[PDB]
Scaffold this active site. Structure first.
Site, PDB file in Angstrom:
ATOM      1  N   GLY A  37     -27.482  32.168  20.169  1.00  0.00           N
ATOM      2  CA  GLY A  37     -27.600  31.851  21.590  1.00  0.00           C
ATOM      3  C   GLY A  37     -26.245  31.513  22.181  1.00  0.00           C
TER       4      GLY A  37
ATOM      5  N   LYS B 185     -30.740  25.483  17.394  1.00  0.00           N
ATOM      6  CA  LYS B 185     -29.464  26.108  17.727  1.00  0.00           C
ATOM      7  C   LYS B 185     -28.324  25.238  17.205  1.00  0.00           C
ATOM      8  CE  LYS B 185     -27.852  26.607  22.077  1.00  0.00           C
ATOM      9  NZ  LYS B 185     -27.867  27.101  23.480  1.00  0.00           N
TER      10      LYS B 185
ATOM     11  N   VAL C 216     -28.620  30.361  16.218  1.00  0.00           N
ATOM     12  CA  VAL C 216     -30.000  29.879  16.167  1.00  0.00           C
ATOM     13  C   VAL C 216     -30.660  30.127  14.808  1.00  0.00           C
ATOM     14  CG1 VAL C 216     -32.204  29.780  17.372  1.00  0.00           C
ATOM     15  CG2 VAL C 216     -30.153  30.399  18.638  1.00  0.00           C
TER      16      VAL C 216
ATOM     17  N   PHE D 115     -23.194  29.337  22.955  1.00  0.00           N
ATOM     18  CA  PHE D 115     -22.483  28.245  22.271  1.00  0.00           C
ATOM     19  C   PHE D 115     -23.168  27.784  20.979  1.00  0.00           C
ATOM     20  CE2 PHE D 115     -19.512  27.999  25.686  1.00  0.00           C
ATOM     21  CZ  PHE D 115     -20.228  28.073  26.876  1.00  0.00           C
ATOM     22  N   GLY D 116     -23.650  28.734  20.180  1.00  0.00           N
ATOM     23  CA  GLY D 116     -24.282  28.401  18.906  1.00  0.00           C
ATOM     24  C   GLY D 116     -25.039  29.517  18.210  1.00  0.00           C
TER      25      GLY D 116
ATOM     26  N   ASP E 177     -28.023  32.303  33.593  1.00  0.00           N
ATOM     27  CA  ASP E 177     -28.096  33.315  32.538  1.00  0.00           C
ATOM     28  C   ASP E 177     -29.544  33.745  32.284  1.00  0.00           C
ATOM     29  OD1 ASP E 177     -26.954  35.058  30.609  1.00  0.00           O
ATOM     30  OD2 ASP E 177     -27.271  33.597  29.004  1.00  0.00           O
TER      31      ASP E 177
HETATM   32  C1  SM7 Z   1     -31.992  25.034  21.758  1.00  0.00           C
HETATM   33  C2  SM7 Z   1     -32.456  26.286  21.388  1.00  0.00           C
HETATM   34  C3  SM7 Z   1     -33.317  26.850  20.276  1.00  0.00           C
HETATM   35  C4  SM7 Z   1     -33.199  28.313  20.797  1.00  0.00           C
HETATM   36  C5  SM7 Z   1     -33.795  29.452  20.209  1.00  0.00           C
HETATM   37  C6  SM7 Z   1     -33.586  30.716  20.816  1.00  0.00           C
HETATM   38  C7  SM7 Z   1     -34.166  31.944  20.264  1.00  0.00           C
HETATM   39  C8  SM7 Z   1     -33.456  33.122  20.082  1.00  0.00           C
HETATM   40  N1  SM7 Z   1     -34.367  34.021  19.554  1.00  0.00           N
HETATM   41  C9  SM7 Z   1     -34.174  35.418  19.168  1.00  0.00           C
HETATM   42  C10 SM7 Z   1     -32.748  35.945  19.469  1.00  0.00           C
HETATM   43  C11 SM7 Z   1     -32.606  37.464  19.218  1.00  0.00           C
HETATM   44  N2  SM7 Z   1     -33.686  38.238  19.883  1.00  0.00           N
HETATM   45  C12 SM7 Z   1     -35.061  37.820  19.515  1.00  0.00           C
HETATM   46  C13 SM7 Z   1     -35.288  36.313  19.770  1.00  0.00           C
HETATM   47  N3  SM7 Z   1     -35.593  33.463  19.407  1.00  0.00           N
HETATM   48  C14 SM7 Z   1     -35.468  32.218  19.835  1.00  0.00           C
HETATM   49  C15 SM7 Z   1     -36.603  31.300  19.830  1.00  0.00           C
HETATM   50  C16 SM7 Z   1     -37.359  31.138  18.647  1.00  0.00           C
HETATM   51  C17 SM7 Z   1     -38.465  30.263  18.665  1.00  0.00           C
HETATM   52  N4  SM7 Z   1     -38.826  29.582  19.775  1.00  0.00           N
HETATM   53  C18 SM7 Z   1     -38.112  29.741  20.914  1.00  0.00           C
HETATM   54  C19 SM7 Z   1     -36.992  30.598  20.992  1.00  0.00           C
HETATM   55  C20 SM7 Z   1     -32.793  30.827  21.988  1.00  0.00           C
HETATM   56  C21 SM7 Z   1     -32.192  29.696  22.588  1.00  0.00           C
HETATM   57  C22 SM7 Z   1     -32.420  28.456  21.961  1.00  0.00           C
HETATM   58  C23 SM7 Z   1     -31.955  27.144  22.319  1.00  0.00           C
HETATM   59  N5  SM7 Z   1     -31.211  26.607  23.268  1.00  0.00           N
HETATM   60  N6  SM7 Z   1     -31.243  25.288  22.907  1.00  0.00           N
END
Ligand code: SM7
EC number: 2.7.11.1
Length: 262
Positions: free
Chosen positions: A19, A36, A24, A21-22, A129
């Site tokens: 994601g 993240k 995941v 700045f990090g 974003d």
């Molecule tokens: C904490 C966070 C946990 C987080 C997970 C993510 C995130 C990125 N992906 C992938 C990336 C590649 N394509 C398919 C999906 N999936 C998630 C996710 C997973 C489970 N629950 C919620 C979100 C994105 C942003 C964040 C984030 N920002 N702050």
């Protein structure tokens, strides 16, 4: 009361991607969680600010359509813990595995996305974003807007013409998020990314900037409602002052949804 999680309670597992700045990971903390993490030896004052900025924004959000912030950790690496959503992002469903959703379901996704964005803009939170990839489908039916690393109180296809040509200092506004929502509306109604027949990235950046390129609205499927197509054009206006705000957009989607199953 505090959301700082005591170290080592978070069990880091599979690397699921990256994601803002990090990096995941799929973790385990009181059940399945999304974490993240920075995975960097020593945090920069740049990276330390970006962490505290996102955590400060996330702790202001409590909504069914916003990715539920659970806590944060600083002691091992700079980590942020949220809920886990089985079933990948909207970008993955539409452009990777090419899932064929029904019109009723496609509008329901658009309604929930607008619902979450209305909640953010009411609390003066600008996403900056908003994209299909940050829109997550939990259990294939519930929309969760995530990744708030660039939020304030990389990807060009969702960027507004104002944003793509940096003038002046702050081109990001409530209406810049509306354009980004206009693009995800396009994606849901077409099943494709905008400007797909153009391979050059720098030519798209320039052409949207000077106002020569706009999304091909006639690409929408035949069963797409005229009220949806009309709203799409309002959100994708080149001038930001001619775009409706989410309170108006939400009411428009809710209106066309009620006169749809018939
Ligand atoms: C904490 C966070 C946990 C987080 C997970 C993510 C995130 C990125 N992906 C992938 C990336 C590649 N394509 C398919 C999906 N999936 C998630 C996710 C997973 C489970 N629950 C919620 C979100 C994105 C942003 C964040 C984030 N920002 N702050």
């Amino acid at each position: 009361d505090d959301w700082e999680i005591p170290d080592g309670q978070i069990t880091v597992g599979q690397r699921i991607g990256s994601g803002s700045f990090g990096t995941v990971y799929k973790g385990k903390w009181h059940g399945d969680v999304a974490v993240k993490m920075l995975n960097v030896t020593a945090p920069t004052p740049q990276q330390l600010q970006a962490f505290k900025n996102e955590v400060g924004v996330l702790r202001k959000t409590r909504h069914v359509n916003i990715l539920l912030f659970m806590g944060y950790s600083t002691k091992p690496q700079l980590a942020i813990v949220t809920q886990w959503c089985e079933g990948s992002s909207l970008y993955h469903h539409l452009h990777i595995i090419e899932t064929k959703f029904e019109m009723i379901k496609l509008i329901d996704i658009a309604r929930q996305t607008a619902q979450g964005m209305d909640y953010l803009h009411a609390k003066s939170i600008i996403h900056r974003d908003l994209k299909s990839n940050n829109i997550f489908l939990h259990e294939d039916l519930t929309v969760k807007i995530g990744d708030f690393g660039l939020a304030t109180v990389g990807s060009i296809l969702w960027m507004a013409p104002e944003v793509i040509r940096m003038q002046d200092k702050n081109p990001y506004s409530f209406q810049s998020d509306v354009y980004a929502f206009g693009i995800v509306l396009y994606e849901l109604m077409t099943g494709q990314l905008p400007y797909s027949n153009i391979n050059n990235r720098d030519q798209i950046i320039f052409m949207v900037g000077r106002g020569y390129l706009s999304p091909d609205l006639s690409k929408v499927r035949s069963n797409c409602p005229k009220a949806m197509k009309r709203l799409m054009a309002e959100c994708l206006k080149k001038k930001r002052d001619e775009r409706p705000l989410f309170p108006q957009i939400l009411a428009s989607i809710e209106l066309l949804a009620r006169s749809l199953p018939k």
